[PDB]
Amino acid sequence: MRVRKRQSRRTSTKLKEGIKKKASAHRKKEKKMAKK
Amino acid sequence: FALPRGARTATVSKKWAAAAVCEKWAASSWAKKIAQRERRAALTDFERFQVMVLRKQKRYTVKKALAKA
Amino acid sequence: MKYIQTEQQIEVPEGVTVSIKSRIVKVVGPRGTLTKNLKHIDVTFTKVNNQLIKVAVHNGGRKHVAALRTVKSLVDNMITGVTKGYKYKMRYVYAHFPINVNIVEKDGAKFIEVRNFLGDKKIRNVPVRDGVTIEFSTNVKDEIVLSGNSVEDVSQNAADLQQICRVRNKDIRKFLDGIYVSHKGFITEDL
Amino acid sequence: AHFKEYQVIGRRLPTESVPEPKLFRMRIFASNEVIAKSRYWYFLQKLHKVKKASGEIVSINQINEAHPTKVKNFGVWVRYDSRSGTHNMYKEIRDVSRVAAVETLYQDMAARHRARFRSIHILKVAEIEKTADVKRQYVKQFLTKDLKFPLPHRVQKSTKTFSYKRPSTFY
Amino acid sequence: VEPVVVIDGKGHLVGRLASVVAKQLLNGQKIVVVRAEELNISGEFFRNKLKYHDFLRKATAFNKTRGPFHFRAPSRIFYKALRGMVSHKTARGKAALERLKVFEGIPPPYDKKKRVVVPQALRVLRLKPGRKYTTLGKLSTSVGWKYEDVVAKLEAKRKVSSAEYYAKKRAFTKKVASANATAAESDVAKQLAALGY
Amino acid sequence: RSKRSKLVTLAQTDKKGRENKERIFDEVREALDTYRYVWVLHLDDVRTPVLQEIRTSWAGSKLIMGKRKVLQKALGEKREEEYKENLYQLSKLCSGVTGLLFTDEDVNTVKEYFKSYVRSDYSRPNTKAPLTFTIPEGIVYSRGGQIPAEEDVPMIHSLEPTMRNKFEIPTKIKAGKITIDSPYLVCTEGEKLDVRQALILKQFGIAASEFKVKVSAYYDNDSSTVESTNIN
RNA sequence: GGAAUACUGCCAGCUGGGACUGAGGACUGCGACGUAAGUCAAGGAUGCUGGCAUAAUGGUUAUAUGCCGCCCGUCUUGAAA
RNA sequence: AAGCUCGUAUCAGUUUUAUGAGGUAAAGCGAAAACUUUAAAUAUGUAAAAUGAAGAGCUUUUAGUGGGCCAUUUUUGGUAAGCAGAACUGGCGAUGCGGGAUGAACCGAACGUAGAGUUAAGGUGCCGGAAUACACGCUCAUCAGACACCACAAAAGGUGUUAGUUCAUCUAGACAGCCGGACGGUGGCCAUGGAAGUCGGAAUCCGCUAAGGAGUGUGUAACAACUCACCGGCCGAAUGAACUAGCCCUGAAAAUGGAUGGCGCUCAAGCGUGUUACCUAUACUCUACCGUCAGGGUUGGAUGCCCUGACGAGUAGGCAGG
RNA sequence: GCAGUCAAGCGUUCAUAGCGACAUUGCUUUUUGAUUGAUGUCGGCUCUUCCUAUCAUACCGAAGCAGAAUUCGGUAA
RNA sequence: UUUGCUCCACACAAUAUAGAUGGAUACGAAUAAGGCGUCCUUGUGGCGUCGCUGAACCAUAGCAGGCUAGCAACGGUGCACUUGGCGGAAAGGCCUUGGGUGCUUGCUGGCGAAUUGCAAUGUCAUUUUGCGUGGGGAUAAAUCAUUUGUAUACGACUUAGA
């Protein structure tokens, strides 16, 4: 019954904003490759 | 009470009156409890005073009877 | 599909009486009485006559209807155990060391004591569950008979006896020693 | 919202040497006429490339349920969009009015397929006259003679914080 | 409306009861919770035990006597759930927590007082049938509470005495009910019934 | 979602479907059209060699076997329509496995033939066993101690699990041979045969029950009437 | 065949309870009601009544309680450290 | 800032009208998509109706300033993937206030001192003001979820659960089970000690059939036996397969003890959706007061006095009153 | 990894407008089993704690695992 | 230590109150079940009845509750005592006996209230600490200093001494 560590669901601001930037870049590349 | 499925309003009224549903309802402890709640809500201040007086009298008689028996 | 109602039937033979109250089931037949506490299930029991009992689930899902048939089969097993009983025959086999099986009384309770399994110096004790009687077969080699009203008790006793004589750190292709359930039947076998 | 059914009749924009346009009619379920007209323009453009300026709505009426208190089995044909392609769905809804059935369908779509009002198109709502013509068992189940069922485990509402007796769930 | 409210904690969901008690204490009501060993938690016993073991592993690394104190008793588990819902580091929160008592079993003097329930926290009224749930006594004993048997024996003794009291009360109630049934035909009875009494 | 996974087997023969029933219907229509006498027979547990022997016992005559409901529809079950008159009277009397014999030959001849024909087949459950059987205590031999034991070789070791489990016989393998610790009788004269008792008698392979072709009735294309003949 | 009701809208329809405010300081204006006299809710509060007249209200101060509030200046770079 | 001029002035980060533009391919309708006439406007110019505007033009003068970061949009060139070069427009800088537990670039909203009312964004179990509201569904996670997501682990796996689409079979009997049949050349042909449907290589044939593979597997040294492919009897009623979507589990992650903010929550206090009520910003409405500016009046402290209206963020810097 | 081979599927529906999961030539390369280490600004000791992706000890699963010994794997710090 | 200390009663002071203002009014268990009553062949029994909120039940009239005259009943209730039990989970409370003493609004009467001026908590609860009276009760230790060393940096610890 050695319960192991559990991953935190508390989201960090750095990760949240990085994910926002990743999504924006993903959409822009989707548009460009759909054009190509 | 017996009611055909999908019966219209006049048919419902006929079956209702025939089955005497309002009497069956008025003859029960549930409906009587509702009626008592409404009447107590409707009592006046003078009438609440009268209720207190009558409760004291009935109480006197009943305590006497309980001590006797 | 979330059925409105699901029902299962439970037949009652002419000799047994079933009492159900708040999901406690008592079955009393020719051979005794069994009691089952089914309050961990959510079902409704009804009867139309002394020969048939309905078990119903209202507005149940898949797991609820799955438990319904289980409840019916458990009550069926209680009826069968109270009217015909259960008899499990086990056989023990060996190559070199003869398995010695006895009924001993240790601390005021019944034990099946197993000696000399694969030459072991260890004594194996299997407590006899209450309600099941242990016998040794006549004119048959190395057969032990477990008889009882409760199929749960009899089958668990036979399973305990079989597991207590496990072969450790050997080849089960080569070493065949053990106690095995030879047959499962009833205490009445007219035909 | 609380849905109403509107008949909406529109046509092409009249011009010179162009009389008698194709009178396109539709039945739109919406909370109000403004939403009904917007939905009509959207569906008109999807059917054929007719812009809002290229068209004109000549009529819009509210259609009330004829027998609003008669229980009716409805078959509803719809199609809805998602990340995947558009899908066609058939559903059976037992209710007393088309608007009630349509509201039920919108809620069911939101709950099951996560779809929304802007994604659902109601192709047709029709009363299924014969009992035998129903297909879905969750509707066919309520059609048996002398249907009766209990309501086990009644949970009563409490107004006050504390109750002076254990509650019974009997019914 | 009572000066003290005694809640029988049996068959209540821990968090909903804790929310109710916290609001009442902050609003100024004295509350005594009894039978904390009979509180319920929704979810499987293994799941709630896992959550407690996570709580158990949390501790201050350089000095364990400073870290979170893991209380094992059911009354203390409930108290923890309540203190989490009070702002306990302020004077107002401390004054609120001073208005609460929690017990295992029903010791004196509360064993002769009226016990109430909180319907919005009752398992039978809240949980859907078929949902597994956990009992606080079993959870506490599995994590290290050592007085489950003592409390059970004391509660059995209390129940025996309470049953005797209720038998006497039932007899007296029957006698009084008869004495009132003999007086249903009087003029005062008719007038009271006309007024609703 | 929690569903039993159907067994997937890659074998040549495929279930024929509605078209096979259609062709059987057409063939029986042709036979009734182009023959005189149609007999209804019962062949419940009949082997293919026996069926083929009866099939070759005539070339002009035709034997049709198949679905009882399909044959009863082809013959005619109601008075709204039927190929010939009074055929529902014959159709109602058919009971189990159907057999149709189409011929133009003599009724007395076919009756005599079906009376005389007899075969000794495997015993069947719930039937009288003509001869009892009892496995002796020795090493168990294949035939069962009937034929010369010195001539025959004993039972194979591969059948010992089957006998021990399904046949409910205490059996042990010694030096490779199946044995039993005491003589074990399977059945007595005129005793209801169990499924497992039938299985064990067939496993020893002593075919002894007398099988026969029985007829319930027949019909003619000239007089159009039903005659009840009970030949067993 | 005859209604009723719902819903949506309109009334220069009527009427009850609660809260905050009372700026201005002769008159002048626009109106309302009246045969008139004049009156009025019409270019912003008046009438009647009670207690107290001092720490009572209030100020100041020390504390307590609820919520809030990071240590200043300089200097860098968008900016922060 | 100072002068001069005029104020039915002079205009405008706006629309419309007429005149252009990628003619990119949906006009429809032509001499047989190769023709060559048209069309709602995404997105800029010129010139003349809409809406708004009390200040405008010219000439002399004076101060501070002389970096950029982040994002949207379009565009050109690229990488495993990130991305780089341009142009536009926003946000921030000089900027407080409500909310997102917390915060450079997120959502609201810009600020004189107060009172009352209403709201934004965000919320309403408790912490914590405000419905443990109402309604229809879904989900049970052996560390669910309560989100950055039209992002990465993500291609799929699952005998979890729900709802669908298309195929199918079926009372001249469906699915599941029991019991029967499962045949003949033939132990087909080649190598093998042997190989008979089942260690091996080649077409896999012909007949009788309700139906039966020159065989789906176990099984023997070879057989045999069982088996399933297929057909029948039995009783009665819908069943199966392949896909789609939703929620759930897996879809890898280390190392002091810790985090949806905490408690806790399971017909939720989770997820989708609908309808209401409610809570509260320095925002909106109304009032009082302070100041600034402005417009009217003033021959009977005029640096004043009276009446009225609108406004009030601020670094460098400017002007004024103390 | 390179080129492929067909495609489970997909591509605005469109089989060789085009993509594309899972599976199949050649490599240091010749066959009969011949001879053919890096690291300089890091490293020592002591010594605490934690992870498990377990070397040993505990319990299990499979394997011609006879026995003995071993191999692979599961829980487990 | 100039009646010190302590427990009762009245008699006045001071104290400060996370907050009296009719009553915290006692079965247990189940919830796909129960409570109450009644009966029997006594149990998982038969019959009847109840829930659907405590919206209850009990209390509750009198100068913030005065002073008196009767009637009916021998009930209700308080106070100071007394009998006999019971309760150890934190019992500190529950029940009962007897007599005395009051009140009684169960019913009928007779006097008083005003002026607090038209509202102002309009002062009625209970914690503690002192001082005065009259009713009783009981007549110690610890520390320093000295001393030991099973202890010890200093403290502390542990021994001994009329």
Q: Is A34 helix (H, G, I), strand (E, B) or coil?
A: helix
Name the token pair of D45.
Answer: 């453009």
**Measured CA angle at F149 (ends F144, F155), to 5 deg:** 50
Taking CB atoms and an 8 Å limit, are D167 and E20 in contact across chains?
no
Judging by DSSP bridges, how do beta strands C143-148 and C132-136 pair with one another?
antiparallel
Q: Which residue has the tokens 């008869």?
A: E178
CA-to-C1' distance for E128 and H64, Å? 74
Hey, what are D77's tokens?
């044909």
Domains D2-68 and D69-145 share a fold: yes
Nearest to F57 by CA among F97, F114, F100: F114
Q: Domain range spanning residue E157?
A: 148-197
CB within 8 Å of D168: residues ≥ 6 apart: none
Asked if the C-beta of E175 comes within 8 angstroms of chain A's C-beta atoms, the answer is no
DSSP C36: E
Contact C150, C81 (CB under 8 A): yes
E57: distance to nearest CA of chain A, Å?
8
Burial class (CB in 10 A: 0-12, 13-18, 19+), E33: buried
User: What are B53's two structure tokens?
Assistant: 């007086």
Q: Does residue E30 share a domain with residue E113?
A: yes
Q: What's the residue count for chain E? A: 197
Contact flag E53-A3 (C-beta cutoff 8 Å): yes
Residues of chain E found within 8 Å of residue A6, distances taken between Cβ atoms: 54
**Bases along strand H below 7 A from a protein CB:** 26, 40-41, 71-75, 77-79, 81-83, 101-103, 125-128, 132, 134-138, 140-152, 159-166, 169-173, 176, 178-184, 207-213, 215-216, 219-220, 222-226, 228-234, 240-241, 244-247, 253-269, 272-276
Q: Which of the 8 DSSP states describes residue D20?
A: S
E28 part of contact set with chain D, CB < 8 Å:
no
Structure tokens at E143: 């994590």
Q: Which element (helix H / strand E) includes D93?
A: strand D87-95
DSSP D149-162: ----S-----SSS-
Q: Which residues of C touch F2 (CB under 8 A)?
A: 62
The answer to whether E37 CB sits below 7 Å from nucleic acid chain J is no
CATH number of the domain to which E192 belongs: 1.20.5.4280
Nearest to E12 by CA among E102, E158, E126: E126
Q: How long is the CA C184 to C1' H139 vector, in angstroms?
A: 43
Which subunits sit against F, judged by 3+ Cβ pairs under 8 A?
C
Q: Which DSSP string do the residues of chain F spell out, in sequence order?
A: ---PPPP----S-----HHHHHHHHHHHHHHHHH-SEEEEEE-SS--HHHHHHHHHT-SSSEEEEE-HHHHHHHH--SSS--SSTTHHHHHHH--SSEEEEEE-S-HHHHHHHHHH--EEE---TTS--SS-EEE-SSBPBSS-SSS-TTTSPBPPGGGHHHHHHTS----EEETTEEE-SS-EEEE-TT-PPPHHHHHHHHHHT---EEE--EEEEEEETTT--EE---B-
Compute the C-alpha angle B11/D104/D151, nearest 5°: 60
Q: Which residues pair with C143 in a beta bridge?
A: C91
Provide the CATH number for the domain formed by D2-68 in this structure.
Answer: 3.10.20.10
Q: Are residues E152 and E123 in the same domain?
A: no
Q: DSSP letters along chain E, please?
A: --SEEEEE-TTBBHHHHHHHHHHHHHHT-EEEEE-GGG-EEES-HHHHHHHHHHHHH---SS-TTTS-----SHHHHHHHHHHTTTTTTSHHHHHHHTTEEE-SS--TTGGGS--BB-GGGBHHHHSPTT--EEEHHHHHHHHT---HHHHHHHHHHHHHHHHHHHHHHHHHHHHHHHHHHTTTTSHHHHHHHHHT-
Cα–Cα dist D130/D73, whole Å: 9
Domain C1-85 has CATH 3.40.50.460: no
Chains E and A, touching by 3 or more CB pairs within 8 angstroms = yes
CA dihedral sign of residues D43, D48, D51, D56 = negative
Q: Is residue E110 located within the same domain as residue E125? A: yes
Collapsing DSSP states into helix, strand and coil, what is residue C37?
A: strand
Tokens 């364990």 correspond to: E64
Distance between CA atoms of residues C129 and C119, nearest Å: 27
The answer, for E4 touching chain D at a CB cutoff of 8 Å, is no
Nearest-angstrom CA–CA distance, C153 and C131: 8
Distance CA D81, CA E127 (A): 36
Separation of alpha carbons F46 and F119, rounded Å: 10
Check whether residue F68 has its CB closer than 7 Å to nucleic acid strand H: yes
Q: Within chain C, which residue ranges are assigned CATH 3.90.930.12?
A: 1-85, 86-191
- Method used to solve the structure: cryo-EM
CA atoms within 13 A on the CB side of C54: 11
Please give the backbone phi and psi of residue C40, each rounded to the nearest 5 degrees, phi first. Answer: -80, -5
Instruction: For the domain made up of D69-145, give the CATH fold.
Output: Ubiquitin-like (UB roll) (3.10.20)
Minimum distance, in Å, between the CA of residue B17 and any CA atom of chain E: 28
Burial C47-68 (b: 16+ CB within 10 A, else e): eeeeeebebebbebeeebeebb
How far is residue C2's CA from residue C64's CA, in Å, rounded to a whole number? 10
Query: Residue D123 and residue E133: Cα distance in Å, rounded?
Result: 46
The residue extents of the domains of chain D are 2-68, 69-145
Phi, psi of F139 (to 5 degrees): -60, 130
Is any atom of strand H within 7 angstroms of residue F157's beta carbon?
yes
Pair E76, E136 in one domain: yes
Q: What is the CATH number of the domain that holds E57?
A: 3.90.1180.10
Let me know: does D80 contact D89? Beta carbons within 8 Å. yes
Number of domains, chain E: 2
Q: E29 and E83: one domain?
A: yes
Residue C88 Cα distances to C124, C183, C185, F169, F170, angstroms: 20, 6, 6, 15, 14
Q: Can you give the three-state secondary structure of D119-151, one letter per residue?
A: CEEEEEEEECCCHHHCCCHHHHHHHCCCCCCCC
Shared domain for E38 and E64, answered yes or no, is yes
- Chain D CB within 8 Å of residue C46 CB: no
- Strand J bases near protein CB (under 7 Å) are 18-21, 23-34, 36-38, 44-45, 49-61, 73-76, 87-94, 105-107
Distance CA C97, CA C178 (A): 11
- The tokens describing D30, both together, are 């919406």
Judge: E125–D166 Cβ closer than 8 Å, yes or no.
no
Residue E5 CA to residue E117 CA, distance in Å, equals 10
E195 and E118, same domain (yes or no)? no
Beta-carbon neighbour count of residue E160 at 10 Å? 10
* CATH of region C86-191, choose from 3.40.50.970, 3.40.640.10, 3.40.190.10, 3.90.930.12: 3.90.930.12
C-alpha E143/C-alpha E145 separation (Å) is 6
D85 is written with which tokens?
A: 């392609």
Other Cβ atoms less than 10 A from the Cβ of E97: the count is: 17
